[PDB]
Design a protein around this nucleic acid. Structure first.
Lengths: 155, 156
RNA sequence: AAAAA
């Protein structure tokens, strides 16, 4: 059979990975993951609309001494194939730079961006992560006081 | 090592899928998908919070002659494992009930629910779909008029 | 809030 199999699904990581690749829609959630994981390497995949947010994340990362790859851009946030291709490129680029353990944080972007990132993570044998939060009812944004680093799959 | 040989594309057919399983957050998108695919069977996975919306979808479907399975429930929308288990059961239940071509619509529910549904679809060799819209910047809502059925993955 | 909004 050629059918895919997911032997380890779910769970929580509360720190390890030294590299993280993000799909990007906002800057605050990747900045939180950066503070939790303290990676030495970072990859970023964004859209035209979220490019500025991704550049804000990279600017904070560089001032902490993190090696940043990207932001790479996808032309269509609805297309899972473009996000798969760009995340797979960054995972390869991080590995060729010496990065060992890498995770893909697929929280940001539209669902096809996250699903393409997941497929690229699975094809590379790397873990996929998701930042679970409750919604801040009074500030109308994710409540990062509630943030938990959940694990989607560990190949 | 998993591999995804067929990723992306656009789907336009009222006869390709006999059944659709939804992860549920709202009733509007599943009702749109029902109209487009016109399935004979439907499965539904919900949380305690989205159970009422899933029941609204089921009620509409029953009155159109669709055989509805579920809603099954997951305790936590942030955990992929429960959604994966419940979608896997529904895919099996639909196959046992006579449904030969099933899709999983990933659009609804929290992202971990969708990711669990994707993993169950892949393990069952069934296709995953997404309802793409452009943002209706006038109403600050997804623009349902722009809705197109996207293919996420088509397992071999 | 759970269709990047």
């Amino acid at each position: 059979l050629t059918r895919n199999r997911f032997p380890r699904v779910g769970g929580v990581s509360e720190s390890q990975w030294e590299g993280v690749v993000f799909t990007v829609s906002n800057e605050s959630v990747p900045r939180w993951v950066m503070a939790q994981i303290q990676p030495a390497y970072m990859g970023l995949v964004a859209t035209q609309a979220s490019l500025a947010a991704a550049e804000a994340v990279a600017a904070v990362a560089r001032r902490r001494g993190i090696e940043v790859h990207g932001p790479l851009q996808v032309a269509d946030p609805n297309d899972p194939a473009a996000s798969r291709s760009q995340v797979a490129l960054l995972l390869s680029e991080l590995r060729r730079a010496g990065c060992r353990e890498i995770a893909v944080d697929l929280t940001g972007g539209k669902l096809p961006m996250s699903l393409g990132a997941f497929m690229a993570a699975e094809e590379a044998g790397v873990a996929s992560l998701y930042v679970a939060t409750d919604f801040d009812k009074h500030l109308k944004v994710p409540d990062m006081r509630t943030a938990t680093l959940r694990q989607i799959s560990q190949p």
